[PDB]
Amino acid sequence: GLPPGPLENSSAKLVNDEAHPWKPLRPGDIRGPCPGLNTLASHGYLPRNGVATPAQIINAVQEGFNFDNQAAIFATYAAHLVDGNLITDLLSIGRKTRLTGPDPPPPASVGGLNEHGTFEGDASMTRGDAFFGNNHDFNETLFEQLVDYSNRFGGGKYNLTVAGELRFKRIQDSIATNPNFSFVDFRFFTAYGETTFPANLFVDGRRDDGQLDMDAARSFFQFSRMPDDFFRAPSPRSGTGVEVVVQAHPMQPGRNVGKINSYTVDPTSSDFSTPCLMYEKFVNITVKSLYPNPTVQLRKALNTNLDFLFQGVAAGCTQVFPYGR
Ligand code: HEM
Ligand SMILES: CC(C)NC[C@H](O)COc1cccc2ccccc12
Ligand SMILES: CC(C)NC[C@H](O)COc1cccc2ccccc12
Ligand SMILES: CC(C)NC[C@H](O)COc1cccc2ccccc12
Ligand SMILES: CC(C)NC[C@H](O)COc1cccc2ccccc12
Ligand SMILES: *[C@@H]1O[C@H](CO)[C@@H](O)[C@H](O)[C@H]1NC(C)=O
Ligand SMILES: *[C@@H]1O[C@H](CO)[C@@H](O)[C@H](O)[C@H]1NC(C)=O
Ligand SMILES: *[C@@H]1O[C@H](CO)[C@@H](O)[C@H](O)[C@H]1NC(C)=O
Ligand SMILES: *[C@@H]1O[C@H](CO)[C@@H](O)[C@H](O)[C@H]1NC(C)=O
Ligand SMILES: *[C@@H]1O[C@H](CO)[C@@H](O)[C@H](O)[C@H]1NC(C)=O
Ligand SMILES: [Cl-]
């Protein structure tokens, strides 16, 4: 389907409403590394089994949380291209599942959002690095560290100052312990943006003060559950305030090189000075390497989804065409 447009009415409103109650997981229901999508599934803004189309995802993030359209489009089509089934138009928000349909050939994985190194990556706030065995479940120890950082830098609330400190702490901990730590290109970007989302989108929209309380934080991060009477944000947004997070502890993109404490800067990575390069590498390298020589129907699906992806790219970038036009 065509990507949905922006909300006709983007006011704050009750989103934990009669039509969208929280329900617990049934056997087979899939949740993954994204507390936003998890919460939308657990309130029925998405299918409750956690398998959805790109259009369903875009509508859900807008309706349920007031995620802005451009961000919704870029994130959703990026995820779908690398983790979803392009023929069936289905993406798992978590683990790989037969519910997304017949798989394409190797080397494409169609691994859902749980697939490490495509969208999901290291130094997540409340999820462990894939190297440590589980990149998707809520981790209590990591959440308690988020609480501790909120106590120390946020007066007990999570805000952009807390985000700046916690983002850096998680990077440093991965450098110290994960010999395979990777922090380049798309993950370098998303790792920063995601730390703003709890302050911008999990804060009740009647307040919109950037100060997330720990009861609400746990509700979203652990239980995929909106607080009782939760109002979404009062305008469309995504990653505003990311500048505060970066400014706290500016980092270069890089990786450990097969040992702990060996963080080595990658001069071929994009960074915040080269946003168009991030897009170009995502398409030319990441997507292309999953689908190096697609058959006719896959090529058509790839090109359609790549056109949609480009709608979410910041103005000023040039579209690239890995499979021609
Ligand atoms: C628009 C479609 C979206 C997709 C496909 C998506 C997918 C993902 C994925 C795969 C991750 C894993 C990144 C990591 O390794 O840490 C992630 C991180 C995250 N996403 Fe989303 N996301 C979307 C939008 C949203 C929205 C709307 C919210 C909030 C309303 C949100 C909140 C988060 C948070 C908080 C994290 C980091 C969680 C943590 O580090 O513990 N995302 N997202
Ligand atoms: C169904 C689900 C939302 N139940 C919520 C729990 O009964 C209450 O949750 C909680 C409430 C208060 C503190 C906590 C600390 C750790 C883990 C959970 C906590
Ligand atoms: C509302 C609009 C200005 N948002 C786009 C800006 O680049 C801010 O958002 C973002 C900034 C930086 C990284 C991110 C990663 C994923 C999603 C959004 C991100
Ligand atoms: C630090 C701040 C000023 N910059 C934020 C970044 O420029 C956000 O960039 C981006 C964030 C998310 C997706 C994208 C897709 C294409 C191009 C740029 C994207
Ligand atoms: C790897 C890359 C060069 N190939 C992508 C495209 O297959 C390039 O060739 C093609 C270009 C245009 C239309 C086509 C239709 C079916 C199969 C191939 C087509
Ligand atoms: C937009 O929605 C809000 C909240 O539901 C409502 O109060 C407002 O009147 C709506 N505006 C229009 C133009 O319908
Ligand atoms: C290790 O890093 C490589 C390349 O950076 C990646 O392909 C692989 O999935 C990573 N594995 C884990 C468990 O981190
Ligand atoms: C949670 O994260 C901690 C700290 O990184 C780690 O030691 C632990 O194994 C993780 N998993 C669980 C299930 O607690
Ligand atoms: C975070 O909270 C602390 C304590 O209230 C405050 O000093 C800091 O200015 C806050 N930061 C933001 C970005 O709101
Ligand atoms: C991506 O490929 C296009 C050709 O399709 C090329 O013009 C562009 O320079 C490439 N960009 C990168 C970063 O490789
Ligand atoms: Cl919007």
Ligand SMILES: [Mg+2]
């Ligand atoms: Mg992760």
